[PDB]
Amino acid sequence: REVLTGGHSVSAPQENRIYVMDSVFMHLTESRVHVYDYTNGKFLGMVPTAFNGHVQVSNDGKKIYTMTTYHERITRGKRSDVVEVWDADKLTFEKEISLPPKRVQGLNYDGLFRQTTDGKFIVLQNASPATSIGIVDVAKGDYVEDVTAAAGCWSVIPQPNRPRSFMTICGDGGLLTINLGEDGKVASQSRSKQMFSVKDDPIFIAPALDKDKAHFVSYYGNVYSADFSGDEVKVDGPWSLLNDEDKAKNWVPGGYNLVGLHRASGRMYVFMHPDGKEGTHKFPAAEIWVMDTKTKQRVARIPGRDALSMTIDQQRNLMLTLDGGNVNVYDISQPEPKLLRTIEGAAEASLQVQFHPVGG
Amino acid sequence: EVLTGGHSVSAPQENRIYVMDSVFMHLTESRVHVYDYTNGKFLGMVPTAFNGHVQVSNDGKKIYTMTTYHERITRGKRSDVVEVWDADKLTFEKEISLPPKRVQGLNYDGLFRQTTDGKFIVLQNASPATSIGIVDVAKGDYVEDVTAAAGCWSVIPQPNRPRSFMTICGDGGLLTINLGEDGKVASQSRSKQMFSVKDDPIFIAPALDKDKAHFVSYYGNVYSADFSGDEVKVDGPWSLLNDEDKAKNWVPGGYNLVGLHRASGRMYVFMHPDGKEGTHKFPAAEIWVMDTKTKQRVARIPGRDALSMTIDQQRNLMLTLDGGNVNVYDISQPEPKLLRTIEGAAEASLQVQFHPVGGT
Amino acid sequence: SLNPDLANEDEVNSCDYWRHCAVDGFLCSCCGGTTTTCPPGSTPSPISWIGTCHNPHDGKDYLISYHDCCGKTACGRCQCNTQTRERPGYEFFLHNDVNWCMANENSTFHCTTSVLVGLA
Amino acid sequence: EVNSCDYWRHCAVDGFLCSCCGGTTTTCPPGSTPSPISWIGTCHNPHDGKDYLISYHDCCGKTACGRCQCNTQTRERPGYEFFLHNDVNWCMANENSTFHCTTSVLVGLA
Ligand SMILES: *[NH2+]CCc1ccccc1
Ligand SMILES: *[NH2+]CCc1ccccc1
Distance CA A231, CA A218 (A): 25
**Cβ–Cβ of D62/A2 closer than 8 Å?**
no
Of D21, D34, D63, the CB nearest to A30: D63
Question: For residue B69, what are the contacts with CB-CB under 8 A and spacing of at least 6?
Answer: A72, A73, A74, B49, B50, B78, B79, B81
Distance CA D86, CA B128 (A): 13
**B68 interfacial to chain D (CB closer than 8 Å):** yes
Search chain B and give the residue with CA nearest D66. B25
For residues B318 and B309, is the Cβ–Cβ distance under 8 A? yes
Distance CA B330, CA C41 (A): 32
Residue B51 counted as an annotated binding residue: yes
C-beta D58 within 6 A of ligand 2:
yes
CA A343 distance to own-chain centroid: 20
Distance CA B277, CA D11 (A): 11
* Phi, psi dihedrals of residue C11, rounded to the nearest 5°: -70, -45
For residues D16 and D68, is the Cβ–Cβ distance under 8 A? yes
Search chain D and give the residue with CA nearest B76. D96
**D58 interfacial to chain B (CB closer than 8 Å):** no
C-beta C112 within 6 A of ligand 1:
yes
Helix (H), strand (E) at residue B234: strand B233-239
Distance CA C116, CA B1 (A): 6
Pocket test for ligand 2, best of B28, B30, B104 (most atoms within 8 A of CB): B104
* Cβ neighbours of B1 in C, within 8 Å: 35-36, 115-117
* Cβ neighbours of D97 in B, within 8 Å: 50, 68, 70, 78, 104
* Phi, psi dihedrals of residue A14, rounded to the nearest 5°: -50, -40
Q: Domain spans of chain C?
A: 1-120
Distance CA D14, CA D5 (A): 10
**Cβ–Cβ of A69/C72 closer than 8 Å?**
no
Q: Name the DSSP class of A28.
A: G
Q: Nearest to residue A347, comparing CAs of A25, A10, A9, A16?
A: A25
Q: Is the dihedral of CA A343, A345, A346, A348 positive or negative?
A: positive
For residues A318 and A329, is the Cβ–Cβ distance under 8 A? yes
- From the CA of C24, which ligand is nearest? 1
Pocket test for ligand 1, best of C38, C66, C68, C115 (most atoms within 8 A of CB): C68
For residues B206 and B213, is the Cβ–Cβ distance under 8 A? yes
* Phi, psi dihedrals of residue B257, rounded to the nearest 5°: -100, 0
Beta-sheet pairing, A43-48 with D69-71? unpaired
- C94 in helix, strand or coil? helix
Residue D88 counted as an annotated binding residue: yes
Structure solved using which method? X-ray
- Tally Cβ neighbours within 10 Å of residue B256: 26
* DSSP one-letter string for B258-315: EEEETTTTEEEEEEESS--TT-TTPPPSEEEEEETTTTEEEEEEE-TT--EEEEETTT
Secondary structure of B171-225 in HEC code, one letter for each residue: CCCEEEEEECCCCCEEEEEECCCCCCCCCCCECCCCEECCCEEEEEECCCEEEEE
CA of D88 to the centre of ligand 2 (A): 5
Position B171: which residue type?
D
C-beta C24 within 6 A of ligand 1:
yes
Residues B191/B194/B196/B197 CA torsion (nearest 10 deg): -60
- Tally Cβ neighbours within 10 Å of residue B316: 15
The answer to whether residue C68 is catalytic is yes
Q: Is D87 left (phi over 0), alpha (psi -120 to 50) or beta?
A: alpha
- From the CA of D57, which ligand is nearest? 2
Q: Establish, for the pair of chains A and B, how many residue pairs have beta carbons separated by less than 8 Å.
A: 31
For residues B237 and B217, is the Cβ–Cβ distance under 8 A? yes
Maximum distance among all Cα pairs of chain C, rounded to whole angstroms: 39
Q: Is the dihedral of CA B128, B131, B132, B138 positive or negative?
A: negative
- C10 in helix, strand or coil? helix
Q: Nearest to residue A20, comparing CAs of A60, A49, A61?
A: A49
Residue C10 counted as an annotated binding residue: no
Q: Establish, for the pair of chains A and D, how many residue pairs have beta carbons separated by less than 8 Å.
A: 73
CATH of the structural domain C1-120, one choice from 3.20.20.80, 2.60.30.10, 1.10.101.10, 2.60.40.10:
2.60.30.10
**Exposed e or buried b per residue across C47-81, where buried means at least 16 C-beta atoms within 10 angstroms of its C-beta:** bbbbbbbbbeeeeeebebbbbbbbbbbbbbbbbbe
Pocket test for ligand 2, best of B26, B28, B48, B51 (most atoms within 8 A of CB): B51
Q: Name the DSSP class of A194.
A: P
CA terminus-to-terminus distance, chain B? 44
Search chain C and give the residue with CA nearest A198. C91
Q: Nearest to residue A235, comparing CAs of A291, A167, A160?
A: A167
Distance CA A108, CA D67 (A): 23
**A40 interfacial to chain D (CB closer than 8 Å):** no
- D95 in helix, strand or coil? coil
Distance CA C25, CA C67 (A): 11
Helix (H), strand (E) at residue A245: helix A244-248
Helix (H), strand (E) at residue C41: none
Helix (H), strand (E) at residue B156: strand B152-157
Beta-sheet pairing, B164-169 with A222-227? unpaired
Residues A76/A79/A84/A90 CA torsion (nearest 10 deg): -20
Q: Nearest to residue A357, comparing CAs of A111, A55, A131?
A: A55
Determine the atom of ligand 1 nearest the C-alpha atom of C112.
1
Distance CA A235, CA B230 (A): 91
Distance CA A93, CA A86 (A): 4
Is D108 buried (19+), middle (13-18) or exposed (0-12) by CB count in 10 A?
Answer: exposed
Beta-sheet pairing, C60-66 with C43-44? unpaired
Is B298 buried (19+), middle (13-18) or exposed (0-12) by CB count in 10 A?
Answer: middle
Query: How many angstroms is the resolution?
Result: 1.5
For residues A211 and A160, is the Cβ–Cβ distance under 8 A? yes
* Phi, psi dihedrals of residue C10, rounded to the nearest 5°: -60, -30
Distance CA C16, CA B120 (A): 50
Minimal C-alpha gap between C46 and chain A (Å): 11
Position A208: which residue type?
A
C-beta C86 within 6 A of ligand 1:
no
For residues A102 and A127, is the Cβ–Cβ distance under 8 A? yes
Helix (H), strand (E) at residue A246: helix A244-248
- B48 in helix, strand or coil? coil
Distance CA B145, CA B158 (A): 19
Distance CA A157, CA B258 (A): 61
CA of A282 to the centre of ligand 1 (A): 15
- For the domain covering D1-110, report its CATH number: 2.60.30.10
**Per-residue CA distances from B50 to A95, B73, B143, C87 (Å):** 24, 9, 24, 37
Distance CA A43, CA A252 (A): 35
Q: Nearest to residue B269, comparing CAs of B203, B212, B327, B330?
A: B203
Distance CA B214, CA B268 (A): 11
**B5 interfacial to chain D (CB closer than 8 Å):** no
Q: Nearest to residue A150, comparing CAs of A117, A121, A128?
A: A128
- The angle formed by the CA atoms of residues B32, B36 and B42, to the nearest 5 degrees, is 55
Residues in chain B: 360
The answer to whether residue D39 is catalytic is yes
Distance CA B69, CA A176 (A): 43
Helix (H), strand (E) at residue A244: helix A244-248
For chain D, strand residue ranges (E) read: 14-16, 33-44, 51-60, 69-71, 99-102, 105-109
* DSSP one-letter string for B55-118: EE-TTSSEEEEEEEEETTSSSS-EEEEEEEEETTTTEEEEEEEE-TTB--B---GGGEEE-TTS
Distance CA B65, CA B12 (A): 21
Helix (H), strand (E) at residue D44: strand D33-44
Closest residue to atom 6 of ligand 1, CA basis: C99
- Tally Cβ neighbours within 10 Å of residue A236: 14
**What domains, with CATH codes, occur in chain A?**
13-356 (2.130.10.10)
Task: Give strand pairing partners of A164.
Answer: none
